[PDB]
């Protein structure tokens, strides 16, 4: 379906076999599939099968998952967001506490 | 993201980070994203990234959220609706 | 409706009247409908009505169902997958 470096899944809290939405920034296509884990550190985002009609190598995409919970909990819920640049390099931060000047 | 003036979110009962559907009255496009709050009183309705392929400045849209509940509750449920005109001027009724 | 050989439904754990997503590998179309059982051993995958605008005889498709469960359960969950080739000949592994 869509294979994703396990490190990226860890950061976003996305599970293997979880429903995901993929929003293609490059071409505007929007679709839903499920996540599979790619090897840790591979930095892979692979699209397979039917979904390959909706994204090409080099396209920039946002991959999201959604959960349900009662309203009371939802009021303070915080999503797990990972940001990327360049060749799927995950940005910190999480900055190191300043120990040098 | 779809950033939305917090006052508008309050009136519709929509939460930050809640799934929303956007139905574009102008072009007929229909998509789903999530809500983020814009500054109170800004009157902002902002689409970013991929969603900017589906709406443009000036387009008239409906932004909806859906919840789940048991049948009995559903049968007496009243949605929170805010109606707009003009410079995103909000009213309680149409 | 999407009528599906009951043997195939059993292997994938899909229920009659359950919501299903259909992803058309041949043409890239993606849609959602519900499953109805076809006769056991018929090997039928039938699309009707509106859905016949999205698939044709010969198209290769993936038919999926989704369930909800708490996080802990989700973290050890193993989907029920049936793999096909040929004359809708089913296997357990690919």
């Amino acid at each position: 379906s869509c294979a994703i470096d396990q490190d990226f899944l860890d950061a976003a809290g996305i599970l293997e076999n979880e429903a995901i939405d993929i929003w293609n920034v490059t071409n505007g296509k929007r679709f839903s599939t499920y996540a599979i884990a790619a090897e840790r550190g591979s930095r892979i985002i692979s699209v397979a099968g039917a979904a390959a009609h909706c994204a090409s190598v080099g396209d920039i995409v946002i991959i999201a998952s959604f959960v349900t919970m009662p309203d009371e909990e939802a009021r303070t819920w915080r999503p797990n967001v990972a940001y990327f640049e360049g060749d799927n390099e995950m940005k910190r931060t999480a900055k190191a506490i300043p120990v040098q000047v | 993201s779809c950033a939305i003036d917090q006052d508008f979110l309050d009136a519709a009962g929509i939460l930050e980070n809640e799934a929303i559907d956007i139905w574009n009255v102008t072009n007929g496009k229909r998509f789903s994203t999530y809500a983020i709050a814009a500054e109170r009183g800004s009157r902002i309705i902002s689409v970013a990234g991929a969603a900017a392929h589906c709406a443009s400045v000036g387009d008239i849209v409906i932004i909806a959220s859906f919840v789940t509940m048991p049948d009995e509750e559903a049968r007496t449920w009243r949605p929170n609706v805010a109606y707009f005109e003009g410079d995103n001027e909000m009213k309680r009724t149409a | 409706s999407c009528a599906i050989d009951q043997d195939f439904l059993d292997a994938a754990g899909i229920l009659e009247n359950e919501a299903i997503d259909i992803w058309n590998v041949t043409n890239g179309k993606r849609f959602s409908t519900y499953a109805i059982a076809a006769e056991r051993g018929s090997r039928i995958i039938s699309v009707a009505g509106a859905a016949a605008h999205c698939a044709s005889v010969g198209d290769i498709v993936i038919i999926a169902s989704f369930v909800t469960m708490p996080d802990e359960e989700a973290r050890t969950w193993r989907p029920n997958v049936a793999y096909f080739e040929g004359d809708n000949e089913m296997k357990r592994t690919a």
Binding site: A3, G49, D59, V61, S65, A74, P79 | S65 | -
Partner: peptide, 24 residues
Amino acid sequence: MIRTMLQGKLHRVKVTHADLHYEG
């Protein structure tokens, strides 16, 4: 009343591989 909320996202990742013949 049960809400649907953003759980998490990968923001602006790049597709590295794509093919109709890949499995999954």
